[PDB]
Each structure stands twice: as structure tokens, then as C-alpha cells.
């Protein structure tokens, strides 16, 4: 049962909006296509794929009951990148930089969740 809340508005109009504009965000706009990109064992290792395009669509269509669920999807996206790639890969450094901005924006979110 989806819902419209002050925090979900913030996730869409602050968090996603900010991250999408970052120069490191483009690997996360669409699902990882493991066959196109020649990624051995991607779906053997990553069983819960997530990407920012999916999160954006979920927010635009009121998929979430709570911002906590959307924050979970962001965490899945970042952690999948940390899990599949090697510790010093460029994409891991990009994901860490985006997660830093994510956490900064989350820190400024309204702390109590009100249905609108």
C-alpha cells in the first residue's frame, strides 16, 4: 500500500534530484545489463538488483509506504556495487562519493514522517 509523505517528497525532490545531477551517477541510471556489459556471475552474486532509475519511478508512482523503504532501495543499490566490484575499482569510488551525498541529504530530511 503506497503512500504520500513529507519524507517521500523529500526523497524524490531532494535526494533523487540531487544525485541524478552528479557526474558520477550515470552508471546507476538503469539496471545493470550483465550480458551486454560482460559481467561474469553478476546475478549469481547480486540477487536483489537495484538502480536509481527504478527508485525514481517508484517515487513518481507512489510505490513506497515509507521513506524508510526508499532508503533501503538506495542502500541496496550502493551495496550491490560494493559487493560485485573489486575493492579499488573506480566504480566503487564513484558509489562511495554518491553515498556520501545521499547520507548528507538524508541528514537534512524531516525527522518525523507525516502522510500528506
Amino acid at each position: 500500500p503506497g503512500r504520500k509523505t513529507n519524507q517521500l517528497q523529500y526523497m524524490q525532490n531532494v535526494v533523487v534530484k540531487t544525485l541524478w545531477k552528479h557526474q558520477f551517477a550515470w552508471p546507476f541510471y538503469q539496471p545493470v545489463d550483465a550480458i551486454k556489459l560482460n559481467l561474469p556471475d553478476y546475478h549469481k552474486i547480486i540477487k536483489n538488483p537495484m538502480d536509481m532509475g527504478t527508485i525514481k519511478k517508484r517515487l513518481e508512482n507512489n510505490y513506497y509506504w515509507s521513506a524508510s523503504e526508499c532508503m533501503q532501495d538506495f542502500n541496496t543499490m550502493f551495496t550491490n556495487c560494493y559487493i560485485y566490484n573489486k575493492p579499488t575499482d573506480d566504480i566503487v569510488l564513484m558509489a562511495q562519493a554518491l553515498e556520501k551525498i545521499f547520507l548528507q541529504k538524508v541528514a537534512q530530511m524531516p525527522q518525523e514522517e507525516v502522510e500528506l
Binding site: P27, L37, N38, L39, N85, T88, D89, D90, I91, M94
Partner: peptide, 13 residues
């Protein structure tokens, strides 16, 4: 190699 996934270049560079 560190940019491999990025390349196609990002993942396999």
C-alpha cells in the same frame, strides 16, 4: 583494469 566496469570501459578499463 580499475575502470573496467565503467568502460564497458568503466567495468573493464
Amino acid at each position: 583494469q580499475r575502470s573496467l566496469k565503467l568502460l564497458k570501459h568503466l567495468y573493464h578499463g
